[PDB]
Amino acid sequence: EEFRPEMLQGKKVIVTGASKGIGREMAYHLAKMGAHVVVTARSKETLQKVVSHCLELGAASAHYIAGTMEDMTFAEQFVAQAGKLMGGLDMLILNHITNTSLNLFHDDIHHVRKSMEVNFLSYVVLTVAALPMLKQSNGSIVVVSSLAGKVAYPMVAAYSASKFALDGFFSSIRKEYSVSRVNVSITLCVLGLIDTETAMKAVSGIVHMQAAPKEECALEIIKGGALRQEEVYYDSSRWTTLLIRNPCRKILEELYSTSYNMDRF
Template structure:
């Protein structure tokens, strides 16, 4: 039986300890901007929800090496470290890992070069891990949540004039993520129409698939 999410508590304070343990590098992003993870109870982990904080994909306009490195730590290595640390406990409780990602990790999109690379890395890592867990008969589900444009202030500001898309409500996105994790879905696309767009891209990987969504006449 899937356990309710109603008692999920934020344990972001423990994140700094985990990051310090896994990363011995002097280049450290700010812990409160790196990742948030929610667990029902730390002593008997049932759910691990991985999500970044404070990073808009439309802040990335090129291949700045230091910025790309920071993004890899924020959007990839922190997810991997936390999931790896939590796996033994999740296995004991037949738990779930819920990874909040983006359509930019499924389809290369303009204005998101570094960000897109980190999200593709997430897809590859957790997709491979899912296969390994299945082969080893370990009862831990992995749900990859593929989100589109969400109506946060930062996202709306950064996409103004660049994207011809209606932003989806953040509250509904959060509810969709919770439902996807509780249902132990393999992948969740929000809003729903992102899935056929991705399917079209797989069949026809051509920029024309995206042209109606982006302002190609802009700078």
């Protein structure tokens, strides 16, 4: 139950949206731990800089494959390519998101659809492609979410929708993996305000709250994934840690788990 950096030594890990912010910080922590890494985002130049520094930090191997997660064909092929480079896969870290600003919802259906496609559907496409390799290694799926993916906030309607969707989908397949004895863990990471450049610019003059450090955030995600934890909670406030968990949800899920006859599947 206690974490050690040696747990990630020689592990074959994918980090999406790893050119900046939390994703890059995760690549850096994995490198130091002596893991095999394959990073992705759209910018080739930004990913080149992460691979170079990953090798310097002591990564067992570091590679990149640039491309958009709007392209479900790219998302699918990226996983077959990344597992080929590493000789398999132990951990899939799903972190990328479509660029989003704090705004009231009026009529931007294109932004609602794009948020669902990039923040949620590509995650499903990446999971389908990664599952054969993860089944073989008894691996981990790590889903980076937000507090806006557990509670309601204004100015993020489309973003909150795609984040809530991740919880619904991945919590459902976790229950399916439990009964169909698929030894692949699913870690949902619920994150508060992080001091990344994009987030700090987004909240500027609108939201006034304490920002947690991105370096530590990235580590707590890796920690939970390695410990095969169902959910990881990371925020500045003490109060969030105290009230974010839903004890009644897990109790309800436990009572229903007895009633679902699936010995036909």
